[model samples]
Structure formats: C-alpha cells, structure tokens
Target chain A: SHMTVKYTDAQIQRLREYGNGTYEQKVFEDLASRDAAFSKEMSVASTDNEKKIKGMIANPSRHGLTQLMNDIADALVAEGFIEVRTPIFISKDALARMTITEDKPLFKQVFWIDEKRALRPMLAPNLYSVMRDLRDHTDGPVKIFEMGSCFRKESHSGMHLEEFTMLNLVDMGPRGDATEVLKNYISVVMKAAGLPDYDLVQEESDVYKETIDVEINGQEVCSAAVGPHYLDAAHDVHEPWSGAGFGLERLLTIREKYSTVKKGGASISYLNGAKIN
Target chain B: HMTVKYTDAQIQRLREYGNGTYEQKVFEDLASRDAAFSKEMSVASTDNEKKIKGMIANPSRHGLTQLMNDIADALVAEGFIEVRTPIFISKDALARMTITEDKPLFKQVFWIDEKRALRPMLAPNLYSVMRDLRDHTDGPVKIFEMGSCFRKESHSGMHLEEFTMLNLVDMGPRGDATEVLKNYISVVMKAAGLPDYDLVQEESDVYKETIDVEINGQEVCSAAVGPHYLDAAHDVHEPWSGAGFGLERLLTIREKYSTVKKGGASISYLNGAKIN
Candidate 1:
C-alpha cells in the first residue's frame, strides 16, 4: 500500500475561499440557487466528490472531447495514414512475457484484473497483436496507424494524465533498414504536420540491447540464445526497428515553433542525457 | 477468480525450479554440494532460511536499487516533489469508478483485498483532498506530486500499465503559479544539465479555453483540458480547471534544444505567443 497526503476538512474550505472566480463561482452559486434541493439531498456525499464532479460536468472541452477526436481522425486521414482502432483490454499472459524484470515498477504499474486475466499498459503489445492478425490474414506491407486513449497506472500531472490519447503506427515487411524507415516516416509526417526536423537520441547500449528482444520474424520465441554481451553489435540497431513516435507534445512544440499553439506559454521540458531508448 | 493457466502445483514446481538459479546453482550448489543432509523431518527450517540467505550475503545488483532510494530522498529534500506510498486496498473502490465499464474484464484486476478498488485515478482521491484543503491554503499553493498511476495496457511504447507521472498543482495567484511552474521547469531542465535552448508559446486562438477558476484571466491549475483548449490558460473557473501537460512532449522540446546544449543542435529561430 502506498501513502498519499490526505487533506483536512479545513483545507477544502480554505481552497473554496482562495479563488474559484467567474465560472466556479457561477457554478457553486447556481447550484446553491437552483440545485439547492439536490445539494441538500446529496449532502450525504459531503466527501469532496460532489464538488469535483460538478467541475467535470461543466467543462466545455471535455463535454465536446468527441468533436476533437474527430479532428484527429480527419488529420490522420488527411495526412495519408490509415486510422485503426484496437481493443482497450488485453490478456494478462500476453503482457507478462513482453516485459522483463528490468522493466519493473513500469510492469508493476499495469492495472491488472487478475480474475479476468487482463491488464492495461503498453499499446505495442496490442498493436503488435493487431499487426500479427493483419500480417497473417492479409497481404502486402501494411502501413496502418491508430489514435486512441491509452490507460495506465501513473502519477497524475499536467504532463502525465492517468488517461490520455496516443497515436501510433507501424510499417512492415522487408523494410529498408528499420531506423531509416522510422526516420523517413517521422520526417514525412512531421513535414506534413509542418514540424521541424527531429534528431532521434538514445544510448547505443540501450538501443542495441533492446533489439535483442524485438520480434523481427514474428517468431513467438527466439531460436538462438541472446549473447551475454550484445553491446559489441550496437551499430546494428540502425537495421531492425525503424520506428519514430511523433510524441504529441514534441510534435506540438515543433509545430508551435512555426506558429504558436499557446498564446503566452513557454515550451515543455525534457531531461538531458535521458535518451528515449 | 482468474482461471490461472498454471495450477498451484505447477506454479510451486516451476517456482522451485526457476526461482533461484543463481543461489541454487552458483553458490548453494557449490557450497552445499558436499554438505550432509539427513532425512530428519523435524529439522529446524530456521537453519535452511539462514543457509539460503548466507548465499547472497554480499547481495546482487538489486543491492544497487538502494541508491535509487537515496535519490528519492534528495528529490524530496530539494522540494522537487513529494513522494507518496501506495495504498493496499479493496476492489469495492474499483467498482465505483467508470473503469469497470472501460474494460469488460476488469474483475480480474490485481488487488490484495477482495472489495476495495486498487485506485485507478489517484487524482480523484487527491481531488477529494484538494477540495477539503481548497478553503485552507491561503492564496496560491504549489503542490507537486510524483507516483504510480495504473492501467491494464499490454506493455508497449504507447503504454506501460503502470508508470510514473510527475506533476504540480498550482492554485491561487496566477502570476505566482506560472512563476513556480517556470522555476520547476527550469530546475528540471537544469538538473538534466541541458545547455542552450529555445521555447515557443502555444497558440491561444486556435487552441482556446482555460481553467474553470479564474483570477483576472489566467488558469488556477495545470492540466490536459483537451485539444481546442490544449494551450489555453485554464483558470479555476472552468471545468477540469487545469492544463494536463505531457512529459514526453516536454522532453521532446528539451531533446530538440539539447542538441545545442551539448553542441549537437542549435536554435536557428524561435517565437513566443502570450494571448488572453
């Protein structure tokens, strides 16, 4: 069990007094005037829930999130990538094998439903699962992509929401060097989105180490044993996995460079030496 | 109950066989190979536990994890953020949220208790606390948090069922909140030792809306309010009340600028936008 700070009742009242201003003031006051009966009826929910839900229901963007989703869909189609959708839930066994002990805490974060044998985390496993289906059932180098909400166990922040949208895609079959393919695709998409050129950064050791686990031939299991020290072949990473994730914030920042996204806000942050790999 | 693919017997056998290859083969096998073991059923297990424990007395690479805890301690001391422990809870709490409808097979979710929901959204719980304290903290408050938020996604680049999210809840004075955010961003970037960089403002007209709570005109919190409102300064007056920023996006900007930091990339040009 983890511990988090719990607020005293006095604290909640203090927050109320601080400054809710125009919208919230309107809301609380309206609720007081009109929903007073309901408020009194729901007084049993004296827990912070009533105030919080009231906030959620009143937001316009959230109320119209579906419309924004359609815009993304149109953008994906306009940008020349096929939009695909996958199941929100995945099996537990499929998850357990994809990650290793080194990926723990991350692996541990999965919201696993032990009884139903399901968990949520990486879309790659499911994305790959989708690809496996497409590859086996259909033909040709399918360049399919998807955009949807991904659920994960995480600390909530402006940067890290518990629930948020993700966009991902894969180019399959005898691709010219994996890294090159990813780079090329990213370049094409960013260019389409009017983003700047990107430079993929990660440690050589980490990238090469990762390739050892990639399913190159769609093989369920690796026939050959992974050598204890694979760092010797670090240069080989440019060959296998040619994929670039156009992280939303990064792409947005790049786009903002050409034309601002927020009228008066600073760009996001990134840690140095913290390579993506 | 989950229909575990492997039975208890199978699990027990496999666990015994695979649980300690290093201890059993590397050390225990070598040391106890020549040791005597009589078939006395009444022998003390206290000796066995010590015998096994003695093998890793020096410990393995896992011993290195203790260093991480030190960094965590430093993070707290530096006011980077506060760390909260996990709650071992019942499944009943899980049933109350929309997560059950989010996934059909949520019943199998892992939990120590049978009734409480392993919290899916710590934000809601935090919001509960936030409301309670809403009336207590005078003026603007700077609250930063870092911890686990869980989901059932299959491990992928797009998702890690469980991962760390670092955030700050800034309320009260608008300028003060923004300044605190700026300081924290600079602190994070500097901590990483990133060198030269450029920052651009997000568009406001195209990206409209701010928070529910407004002082003058700025948002009271930071959050992910949606696209039409991605860059808008959301005050406490709006619903969702904040901008939900993404670390990956923030990092992307950092990575772009870092080329200049280590002399890899340079900012050819940049622009800023601040609109109401």
Candidate 2:
C-alpha cells in the first residue's frame, strides 16, 4: 500500500532530522569522495553561508538623519546662513496660528503631549518665533535654518514616517529675487543631500495658499513660500522672507532609491537603505 | 597670584577613580581636597588621544545591531530562510489576520493611504510567503523575518513608535504544536542573550489567547499555534507554530536599559551613545 511510502518518508525524516548539522558534514565528505566536481560544489556551498557581517565594531555608522543634518547645515552655512535648533515640543496655539484646528485633519495627525502642546509636526512655527527675535537683532538680512525630527500621526505611506527629519530654512530681508532665491535654496539642498537636479513648480497649500514646491521625479520634496503674508502679523514680524522645509527621509528615498521611507531613516533593520541585520 | 604643585600619587588616584562611572562626584570631591588635582583633572579630560586609543584598541560592537546579528546567525544555522518583506502592507492583507477597524491594534496601524498601511506585524507577510511556497511545493515551510514595525503607541517606557520585530514560524509540524512553539521560544531566547523568562498565556485582541514569553514584568516575545481560527480563511490548514519577538523589549530586559528609546530609531543617539 501507499502507507509504506509514507512510513519510508517518516523514516527518512527521522534520520535527516537526527543528523541535522553534523550529519550533513559526513554526507559532504562521502559526496566529495565521489567526484572533483562534488568537491568544488561543496566548497562554494560552504562559502555561500560564509556571508559574514559588514561595518565592524568600533567604527559604527551614523544614522542618515545626522549625516543629512551635518551636510545640509554645512552647505547652508557655506552660503552664509547660521544654523539654529528649535524646541521639539510646541504649543497648540502655535499650530492654530498655521490654520490647523481641532476640526482639521492635519491637527488629528499631531502627537500631542497634552491639550496645549505636542511634538512638532513641522519646523515652521518655531522658525517663525525664532526669526521674530533674530529680526530684532539684524538689519539687512536674517538668515537662519533648523534641522531636526518632526512627528505626525501620519500614515504607513511608502514615503511617510510617524517621525521624520525636517530641514527648514528661512531667508528674510531678501538677497535676490524671491522666486530665484527659492530655486537656489532647493538646488543648494539637493547638492548637500548628494543628489542635485530638482525641478521647482508652483503648488497650493492650506497655509501659504500659493507655494513653490520642489520635485524629484514629479514627487514633491520641499514645500516653499515667500513670507510677508497674512500670518506675519500674528508672529509680529514684517520682514519679506523666503521659507522652505524639506523632508529628509523623502529626499533620502529619492537619492537612495529606496521604496520606503523607513529605509532611509534611523533603523535597526536597515542602514542607509540597505536592509541589514 | 597662584601657586601650583602636583604629585604623581594624586594623579594615580584620580586616574583609577576616573575609570569608574561615579567619577563625576569623585573628581569633584578630589577637586575640593586640592586645586592642583582639579587642574590636573581638567587637563586629563583634554587627553584626546587617550580616549581615541581606548576606542581603537577595544573596538566594540553596538548593542542593538549586535543583538540583531546574533539572532540572525542563530536562525540561519537552524535552517530558517531569512526573508525581507515589504514594510508597507495592504488593508486587505491585514484583514486576513482579523485586524479590523473594531480591533484595538487596527487603530494603532500606521496607514499610508486608504487601501494600505505600514505593517504593524510580521505574521501577515510571513503567512503570505509560506502559503505561496506551499503552493509551489509541499511539506514543511520554515521561514523568519527581522524588520521594523510601526504603531502609534502612547509615550511609554515599554512601547516605541518604531520597534524591531523578529518573527519565526515552522509549518507542517511533525510533533505536537505546543512542543514546536517551545523549541522556537528556547532557540530564540538563547539567541537573544538567554534572558530569564516565564512562558504564559495572555488574552489576545486577535487570536483570543496567546502564548507569550515575558521577563522582569515585561513581555519580550509573543507566540501562537496555528492553523488558527482566522487561518482557514487564508488557506492555512496544516498544523504550525510561530513566535514573534519585540527586539527592543528583549534588549531592554537583557541589557538593563532604562528606556527603549535609547535602542529605538531615535534621532539623539548614534550607535549606543547620544551624538551629533
């Protein structure tokens, strides 16, 4: 009956399972005795799983965010912009000034610490408040930028992260034409990110109403707009400014060509888009 | 005007105490005893090559990445095929695991759009691959994956917004299902530095009941036996057992880290120490 075949299969399984690791070596030695071809196959087969790890001890790799922050800051600093780091937690009042409210979907994404404040979803509010003070000290132009983590209740989207790094630069008291300066800023950032050539196009936003968006392969990379608009009076600043914020992970995905934002961000499972141990 | 004189014996005491963690107040106490020692301590802090040589000579592996490599190697030696699954999963795929909108875990999912979201667990993807493999061939499917999973967890010491998960499964079990699960827990725990733990059952949101490996009052790894109640719908019929581990949970309990954030995909820390 076919039952004998099943018993034979079980018997074979018992010997194989019993012979798990070391048993294979004995089989390999017998197989190696048969032919030189078998010996070559055995050596290569052993070498296949010989796959040792990369990036050894002591000399560890930095997260992409830290690298991006340093390079972007260096590039901006080279262009005469001072670097600034703002507080990560900001007030609900600060978000409301940007036209986000309880009724808005954007507000729902906020990682709130309390009813009054939450982990920042963008660098805009803090940058606005900072420039208000800096503008007090500078005359012709106040150039400053900040790079740090921003959080949102955001999606499992291929391009989004619950926590993402943002590089935001605000150039006030104009150096050149606002539109061209915004383009140059985008170009500067793209170069710093090690991926130059980005196309700038006009887009609309909830806060800015009209905006200049930076794109790579038709995907929006940076959201930019010139200031001295309606919200200026709220922060009590009147300087004409060029402002933009770039999603560091999104830029990383485009530069590294990773299918997900998690690859480019800090990860235990991945380093610089090469999913690793 | 100031007068300064330092002795080698005093420097030896400072150097010995400096190697210990409480050297801060120890050095401070040394400073209070004598200003010359304080001056020498300040100079010692600037001995850049001393610190540089220490790192060069003692080259150590990162705790989290090192743990991951150990687990991966152990699994490889155990005949488990390591898989890389998409970080993003579809809404339909999640439903196969019974993660409906009514489920608590459903709300925690990091959604990408209306139709798909960032995967909150590895089971769905692992099930998908095993089923596909079973279709192509027959008998015994063994696989494992180590990757990042996202959830909108509340700010807690035990939970992280993005954490590592290592899930391994053995399908078509020849022995009792519980015994297969026991082997998984034993093998995985050993790979994870053999942290002490107790295996117990906990009420589940999805499976209705789950086998969990807990330690030091924290749940480090969770396991299950299948073809589960939901498995029939997904075409999994043969008996199987699987275990899912939260890498950070195991790390904190084993390594004695006060917070999981230090080992998470955090911005402040590079490798183990806070940098840049």
Candidate 3:
C-alpha cells in the first residue's frame, strides 16, 4: 500500500505507542527553540528596561509602620468618643460606589483580586460593606473613618502607582442630621493638632452645573459655573454636606512652604507629615 | 508508527484534536465563574453614595459649617466685603482633572479612555475656577468647601472608594508670613474634637536634606504629607505648601481619648461604615 496520512484509530494507537521515541523528541525541541526566540525578541525590542509581563511591586516592607499609626489612633481614642475602621473594597453595583468604567487601560493590565466574585477596583466596595455594618448597629448618629491600602490597576506615573494608601471617614446622624456632630468633630480635631492657620482649597465633583462650590479660608474657592455634577440628582436625592480628600503628597509639598521635615518622611508625604506653607 | 511530514493540514488536524478534548470546555467553565462574581458583589453595597459624583455640603452643615456662618455673619455685619458671594461660582467647573498618563490613576485605571476618570485630587478645579473671578474680586477673602472626592482605590480598614472631603482657602493675605494657613488648620482640627499632638522636627541628615512636618505620639493617625514631581519620584526639590489630615483618622484619635466603654460595647457607641 502507498503510505498516506489518515486519522484512523490504528494510526493514533501507533503514534501513542511508538511516536514518543524520536519523532516527539524532535518536535518538542523545535517548539522550545521557537518559543525562546519569541520571548527574546520581545525583551530586545523594548526600551522600558524590562517587560512587565506580570506585574507586582517588589516586596514592600511596611513593617512597624502600622504600629506607629496605631499608636496615634490610641492617642485619639484616649481623648474621647470612638474610633471606627471603614472597609476598603467596594462594588460597582453599589449606588454610592464610583469607579472608572470598563474598557479603560487599567483593566487591560495590572492586578485585581477576584473577590465575592468581582474585580474590586478600590477600597470603596469593602468600605461600603462596613457602612452597612454601622447603619445596622447605630440607632442615632455615628462618627467613624478608616485608614488602609487601596489598589488601582492603572498605569504608573511619577506620583501615581498601581496601589497606595488612603484614609476615609463617614458620619451618620439621625435622619441625615450629622451637621452639628460633624462640626464638633472638626473643631476638636483642629484644636488638638495645634495647627494655627493654613489656607484651604475646595471643589465639587458635580458636573451638572446645578450648584458647584469650593471655598478656602471662608471664601468661595469655586464659582457657580464650575459645579455640581448633579450626582445627587442621579441618585434621586438632594442634600448638602462638606467633605475633603487631601492629597498626602501635595499637602507635604505645600507644607514645605512653612515647615521643614525629612525628605521622604511623613512631613513630605500626604499620609504622615506636613510641609511648610 | 505512521511518520507524517509536517504540513498545514497536519497542524490543523492537531488543533482540532486538542479542542475536541474536554480541556477547552473545562477552561471556559472556570473563567465564567470569575466574571460572575465581579458582577454580583458590585450589585450590592452603599456607603458614600452621594460622594462618587460629588456634592458640596452647604457650608452651614459641614465641619466648620456653623463656625464659618457665625464668623462670616460677624464679618458681614462688620462690613467684610458684603459677603461678595454666598452664591457665586465660576461656570462649567470640574472637581478633578482628566485622567491622562500624568495622573495617579492613569494606566492602571479601569474606566478611562479618551474621555474622563475618577479624580484623584481636588486642587486644580478650585484653582481654575478661582482664577475666573480673579479680575472681578478684590481684597482678603475666605472660601470653604465640603464635598465628595472619587478615586479608583481598593477597600481597606481605613478607606472608602467614595468619601467626603473638606477644603478651605484664605485668600489675599496681607503679609508674607504663612501663619494664616496654620491658624486655619488649627481651627479645623479643634472643630474635629482633638486637642493634643506635637510638631516634631523634620528628618535631619549628616550631610543635608529636608522634610516638612511630623506629628509624633499618635497611634491612630499620622500627620498627612506631599509635592512630588513626575521626573523625580525620588527627588525632593519642591517643598510642600499644604497639609491634609484624613477626617476619619482624626476622628479615631479623638475617640480613643474620649471614650467610656460599655458592657460589650465601649463607654460610647461607635459605628463604622461598610463601603460596597
């Protein structure tokens, strides 16, 4: 018979029983060489020093740092009131939770933990989870905040990283009556810290132009034209409150104008130190 | 064994044989589960609901809301610029910048394209909007801001993806001294219910180096720190001109000193938010 290739049971049986000898060995060797060359080509052609095929920051030895922070917390608690730790992960499904939509560059690369079955982008999801815990237990007003690490899967930059730290606080009062409670908290903290004076800057995230506002040292920081993303409207509610997200890095930079501290120590960093004004 | 020469037909046949096995089906099944979970959890949870989009708190109700009202009312009564505007703002303002490669949440971000992103900071919007009124306004001024800030961050014990923020600016200072800034920070801290913390010196060096401010002796929170440039993540050329303390951290420190402890509950009642 003239030998011809065919997918018969006899052929598969023969290949499995005997093909493992010379033919398979030669086949695998060729495959290995080709794969190696492709990997080499990628590294050689790139200029970024190294190809970040899989991403992970080299081990961050943040040991004892948490302890330092804990000591501060203890000091605050001794003064009076309560200390509450908020959650760090939040879900897209949550109404209050905000995140970059899909199709963004961060989703393409970077690490994300698949938890509760979702790719949590930030600490909000878990924080929201904690909020529910607060609401369930409190009959009246509640004041609390959190401090923890947050992860982002976005591209890295000078002041940007895939992950960093954040501190968040939330207060709930009777029927949204947290006004007096919040003010008292603010005043007490300021007095305790001994900060004499610092110019403040503020803004609103609302884009709908309803009523955006920003203020500094009791002056309007944002004009009416810039405001109100009308996010409140999106969620079908209307109310007023005050809050601020202070950048640890930028704060340090600005504080340097008035005070002086270690180069990368807390003073220059948003999380730990203060720069001069 | 049948020796078959390498050919397109042979490769195609091999692929078909591999796919024909149960592995592809097995792999696909595993991937499907991961996708489902990312969806389920996101569908629930609601702390920080109003902040994700941004909302300015009526100054009267914010931290120093009443304090400012009392102060401003006194100022207005004493003729401090006629409250130039309790109702004034620049048009089309935004709280955050577009998510270009320059921002902290740039590439690792999940929702930015050519359009927008979750804002990482709150200064630029205020700066731009304030500039619009530069010409129309004159003299010493004070502005207060309370609103939400959005960031693409993971959930943790002391953070919320969407949370409240406070800001203030004391404009047109007559002197070169920045004491006014310190005074403002002091006022806010006192308002939050804390009264003790020390100002440690900057990190010293045998050669020469610089740092900003350190609040030593607190286990709950450290003083906030900043000013970093892109070209120099390690460079410390530009000193900072500002300071920020996370409201939550401040609150916890205050609570630690002022609590009474109940039977399983402490002396005072404290509840934490669960961000979803």
Candidate 4:
C-alpha cells in the first residue's frame, strides 16, 4: 500500500516554511538542499531566468506573491475588467441556492457566523448578485472582477488554508463556446502570472458540475465554468456567462515551488519563503 | 443683528485658506476668518443653502475617487509600487503591532473567528511586507496601499464603520526621515488639492514623533518615523518613515463638507449632497 511518507519535525517545519505542495520525505530533503544552494547559485548567475529568479529571492518583496498579484491585476485591468468589491459575509440562502446544504460536503466547511450568514467560501455568490444588478442597469457585456479574502473551515492538511485570497473575473454577456472563452482567459491570466506550463483539465464540482480546471505541473489552481446554469437561475441571473476563480496563494506556491502554501501567503514566520527571525 | 466682524488680514487669510494657499500665519487670524465664514454662512437664507446644495447633489460625484487616483498615480510615478495585503488579520499579527486584548481599540475589532478579525489598520500588513522587501532588496523600497478599514464603533458625523485610508511607507538606509516625511506630506497635500494646512508635531505611542497635518483645525493625516517603535518585528533595525491619510477627511476638507459620509462613500447622498 502506498501511504503518505511521514516527515521529521525539522523536515516538516522546513516544508511549511518554504514550500507549498505535498511531497515525500526524500523530496522534501532535496528541496531543503535546493534552498541551501540558493546562495551558491546567487554567486554565479548565468541565465536570464536564473538572474530574474535570484533577484526576486534577494528582494523577497519584489518577486513573490505581491509581484504576481500586481502583474495579474494590471493585465486584467488592461483587458477592460472593472474591479469591484463586495462584502465577505454571504447569506445562508445564497449558499443554499448553490446547493451547499447541510448534507453537502462544503456545508461542513462553512464558517457560519449566524443562522442566516456565513463567511463567504466563494466569490461566485456575490458576483451573481453584482452581475444581475449591473445587467439591469447597463447594456451589453459587463466585464467585472473581484479579488479579496475568502474563508472556509478546512483541515490544515496539504496546501489548504482557512483564509486565502481569491481572484474571480467574469463577462456577463452572450455566452459562446465555454472551452474557447475559458482557454483565452486562462492564457491571459497564466501568461500574466509568468507561468509557462499549464493545461486545462475537465473536472466536476458540487456547484458547477461542468467545470474546467487549470493545472500547473499537477496541481489544480483555477476552476472555470459557463452558464445559464442552475446556479445562475437560482440567483435570477439568466445570462450566458463564463467566469473563473483562482486560488492566488496556490498559484504563487506552485509557481515559486514552495512546499507549503503558507510560505507564499501573508505570514509571520516566512516572508516570500525566507525565514523572518 | 449679530454680524461677524473681521480685519483686512482675516479676509486675506480666509481667501488663501479657501484657495489652497494658506500656510503658517498668526493663529488668531485663522480663528477670525473661521468666525467670519461662520457668520456669513449662518446669515445665508434658505434659498442660498438650497442653491449650494443643488450643486453638491449632482450625480457626477467623482471628486473623491479622482483625488485617490491622482495621489496613487503621483506616488507610482515617484517609484512607489502599490501592493494590497490581506484584510483579515490574525490575532497574533495584531499583538505584533502591540495591540493586545486589553487595549481600548481591541474592543472595536470586528472579529470573524477566534483567530481572525477585520483589519483595523494597514500598518501590521505594511510592516510585514516592508520587512520582506528590506531583506530582499539592497536599496530603498517604497510601497503603499489604499483601501477601506473596518471598525465596529458607532458611526459619528466624522467617522464611519468603513473608511478609506492611504498609507505609504519608505524604508531606506539614510536620509533625515523627519525631513523626508515633511517633503512627502507636501507632495501628497499638493496633489490632493488641499488648502493650506499646518504640520503640528505631536507624541504618539506607536511612533517616535507624529507629524499631524491640520486643516481648519482638524487633523487629516499623520506622518511618523521609526527606530525604536517598529524594530521588534523581524528585528530589522532600520530607520523608516510612514504616513497615513484619511481619504474621506481629505475629501471633506477639500470640498468644505460638514461630514465624511457626505463626501464620497454615501449611497443616499451624491457628491456631498443629500438626495433623499
């Protein structure tokens, strides 16, 4: 039987401090050695990409998650996406409309604040209301995006976090072929993130069953769907729309090759994967 | 029959204050101008108030938004990069800011869970990023963030549950940070199109010396420098300067509005004008 390899305390701490994804104990040890080589690699930088990565690591602030976020925002804004902000607390009815019932898997993960409200686990619910309101007032396609903190109650295993940033962009207009639209969006966002290798894989979900996920190496970092779907109908949003949501920390963790997502987020112990006293 | 009386200097000061040119003069002169303005304002008939109110009620209320963008663009042009951090800060992070459970401000926090709460200020996140930037880069680094911060306190004429804040910090190896802070304040104030204001120095618990920018006797922004105050986190013993401005306050002062809510973030009012 193939079981998850157990790691020593030191190795576990190192993984949590620097990396973001799951790895075997041996692989984790290798990563530690790779980080040790960073100083040596800094002494002799020959390739352009190597020089860029080294500079980023040296100026941890300039290179890590902040840089990635700024790049993505610039790219989307240039593509005419109007950035908007909505409250983080969602009504219980909003979650139920998406079928996040007590029997559902996601229901257990909701950090309920009251009988009728819970911290938003996704941006789709609020975006649905925004889309409907904007459509009622405006005409044609309304391109909007929101990037903010979302919450969930999840086991701190693997790269999952209780709080993480989410970036979701949608065009509420006539929906064409889902694959083509999603492909274009994926290329734009991924290219902006400076991620060169990724593939769109078909995946199912509790909410949007017909979903396409953007996978880098092997980790699924983004999910997309097009609709006039049931969820849209629930929110009274009867438009052909396509949108995608990206776990920003996961993208940075995957891109930077960190062993844990914590390293790529706002943390006290780690600043851009560098130990902070 | 109560008509406010003023001297020639008072009228001159009032014009300058209204036109964004007033600066340090006799405190008495400003007081007299305020009295004169108050007198003239009170004597105005209901017809006059309606006329001024109509202009404010226009739907093209983009002054506050424009001012925010102008300041952002000016700073970016001067080599400052804008970066946004998480709004949900953990309790540990707050403690690092020296904000403990017993602190008066702690009670005002809108807690989401046992560990996290809606961020009351941007400094904790900014300090975290600054430490990272300092470790990574060799030279000076400049960064800023502008967004709404939450407080659960009761709303007042001057304060709101959510208010826009623009905080910019510059950390470097050398330069008189106090002087740099003054210069930075001048640049931002001018860009904000604010009237003449005073840099009243004050003492604060968080920073060594706080330079508060005062307009019409109200504090609109605060600038601070560090050495002993912010060195505990990451133990980065470096001199830095930072400033935080309330956007709504600036907007209110600039437009001569009575309260912050009427300036920009109002749903019932548009462009500082009451609609319904």
Residue B2's lDDT within candidate 4 is 29
Task: Order the numbered candidates by lDDT, best leading.
Answer: 4, 2, 1, 3
True contacts kept of 4: 0.05
Q: In candidate 1 chain B, where is summed lDDT lowest over 10 consecutive residues?
A: B267-276
lDDT of 1 by residue, B1-276 (tens): 222233344334333312211222211342233231221111323333343233213212111111222323333343322313233233543544333646654633445335645444454343333333344434443334333445545423333344334444444434443344445444443443333333333424532333222222422224332233321221133222223332322332433321111111111101100000
Ranking by TM-score: 4, 2, 1, 3
Candidate 4 deviant stretches above 4 angstroms: A1-64, A91-103, A112-118, A156-159, A203-209, B1-103, B125-148, B155-164, B169-173, B187-198, B203-208, B214-219, B226-240, B247-276
Query: In candidate 4 chain B, where is summed lDDT lowest over 10 consecutive residues?
Result: B16-25
Which predicted model would earn the best DockQ?
4
Q: How should the candidates be ordered by DockQ, best one leading?
A: 4, 2, 3, 1
Give the CAPRI class of candidate 3: incorrect
Judged by lDDT against the true structure, how good is candidate 1? 0.35
User: Once superposed on the true structure, which residue ranges of model 2 sit more than 4 Å away at CA?
Assistant: A1-277, B1-61, B155-158, B201-210
lDDT of 4 at A43: 38
Docking class of 1: incorrect
- lDDT of the candidates, in the order given: 0.35, 0.64, 0.32, 0.67
In model 3, chain B matches the true chain B with a TM-score of 0.44
